[PDB]
């Protein structure tokens, strides 16, 4: 998933766009 995310500041704020994907899944799991 993060390999196509690089196309659409590198590995600092860009890497902080990867983390919402594990956050959204985590919310569904715990709820």
């Amino acid at each position: 998933v993060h390999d196509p995310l690089l196309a659409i500041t590198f590995e600092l704020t860009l890497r902080s766009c990867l983390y919402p994907h594990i956050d959204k899944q985590y919310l569904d799991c715990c709820g």
């Binding site: 902080s16 983390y19 594990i22 956050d23 899944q25 985590y26 799991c29 715990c30």
Partner: peptide, 26 residues
């Protein structure tokens, strides 16, 4: 023995893994 790279999302890592296993136990 550890890095701090994964720190800003680590809580939601651990708290998802263990809770998913507690789903799997049902």
């Amino acid at each position: 023995t550890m890095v701090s790279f994964l720190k800003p999302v680590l809580k939601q890592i651990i708290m998802a893994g263990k809770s998913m296993q507690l789903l799997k136990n049902l």
